[PDB]
Write a protein that binds this ligand. Structure first.
Ligand code: HEM
Length: 365
């Protein structure tokens, strides 16, 4: 595995943490790819949309200002703090259902297959405005276009979502697709609102799911940390942010291509040379937080780069923190005796996803 993808258990690869803040890999005498490993470099590179590009409808990550600005402008109004707090009741119920499914399975149980791989799509479907009746189908059609062949028919997803869009066009209601139509109507192309739907589901899935499982594993391997979720919501907020920093599920963000010769410290990234930003390494930076190798939920929140930095900052960071706080809090309320069914398992990990996670995890209700 490459160094940036290598993870030693719940932690990233030690070699990343020992590499220079801006490591230069050159294959020639000259394809030069750079790797940012510190909090300061990662922030200068992601924060500089005037010198770095993300270009290789929808998928804001592949867009640069001013095109990225216009797109993100339409969808960003639907991610405010209050807008997300209103989704909290739905989130709670979506999780309570799978927590009820947990009791139905008894003690030995793949939390991953039961809850971690279910809660994400549910909450996301609600945010978009997908009716609870027609939901699994949408999710299944999504997992279908993934071509787990060329026969993958995502045209079904396309027209189901085109129908949802045109219905909310003639009937603006609760949801992101409806909110965008309320203020933009025809100006918001069908393809645009579609690409945005695809984007939100592909970004808020493997990340949250990865955090749902890896978080429980860590909180269970370090039982002094469960207390944060048995008290104030503030005590729990600090803990979600600590877990996000420590586990940094995204290995790296979209590669940043220099649009000109950028001087980063004593080094110079040349035009065309790309920079990979190792978020997990950056969030393990002693300049960001003292004793960065430790998992301590008592820590005061810090400006980690797990949700990004700059114009492409995660549009659902607030939702991820709320969609993870409630779960942990409820998991340790319904099953306040959970442990590792196999205290001697190899913790099967997700090594194929662009986000770290557990492919399987067996608990003991
Ligand atoms: C429901 C959950 C989530 C949604 C809806 C969501 C949505 C998004 C969207 C739309 C973007 C693109 C922003 C833009 O380019 O304008 C984005 C970027 C990003 N998200 Fe998420 N996200 C979610 C969860 C997470 C989680 C849990 C993490 C990390 C633990 C994460 C990490 C990131 C990062 C690092 C970026 C920036 C990537 C880059 O700059 O290229 N996201 N997210």
């Amino acid at each position: 595995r490459p160094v940036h993808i290598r993870r030693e258990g719940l932690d990233p690869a030690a070699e990343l943490l020992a590499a220079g803040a801006l490591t230069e890999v050159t294959v020639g005498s000259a394809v030069t790819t750079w790797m940012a490993t510190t909090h300061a470099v990662v922030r200068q590179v992601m924060g500089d949309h005037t010198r770095f590009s993300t270009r290789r409808v929808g998928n804001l990550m592949d867009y640069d200002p001013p095109e990225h600005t216009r797109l993100r402008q339409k969808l960003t109004p639907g991610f405010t703090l209050r807008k997300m707090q209103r989704l909290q009741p739905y989130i709670e119920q979506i999780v309570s259902e799978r927590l009820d499914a947990m009791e139905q399975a008894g003690s030995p149980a793949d939390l991953i297959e039961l809850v971690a791989n279910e809660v994400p799509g549910a909450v996301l479907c609600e945010l978009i405005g997908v009716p609870r009746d027609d939901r699994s189908m949408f999710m299944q059609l999504c997992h279908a276009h993934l071509d787990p062949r060329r026969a993958a028919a995502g045209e079904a997803f396309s027209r189901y979502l085109l129908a949802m869009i045109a219905r909310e066009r003639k009937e603006p209601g609760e949801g992101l697709i409806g909110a965008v139509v309320a203020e933009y109507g025809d100006e918001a192309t069908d393809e645009e609102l579609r690409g945005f739907c695809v984007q939100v589901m592909l970004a808020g899935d493997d990340n949250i799911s990865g955090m749902i499982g890896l978080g429980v594993l860590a909180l269970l391997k370090h039982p002094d940390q469960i207390e944060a979720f048995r008290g104030d919501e503030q005590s729990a907020q600090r803990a979600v942010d600590e877990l996000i920093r420590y586990l940094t599920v995204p290995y790296a963000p979209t590669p940043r291509i220099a649009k000109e010769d950028v001087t980063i410290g004593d080094q110079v990234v040349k035009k065309g040379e790309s920079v990979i930003c190792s978020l997990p390494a950056a969030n393990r930076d002693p300049a960001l937080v003292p004793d960065p190798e430790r998992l301590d939920v008592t820590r005061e929140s810090v400006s980690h780069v797990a949700f990004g930095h700059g114009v492409h900052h995660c549009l659902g960071a607030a939702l991820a923190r709320l969609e993870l706080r409630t779960f942990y809090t409820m998991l340790w309320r319904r099953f306040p005796t959970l442990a590792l069914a196999d205290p001697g398992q190899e913790n099967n990990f997700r090594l194929t996803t662009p986000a770290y996670g557990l492919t399987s995890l067996m608990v003991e209700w």
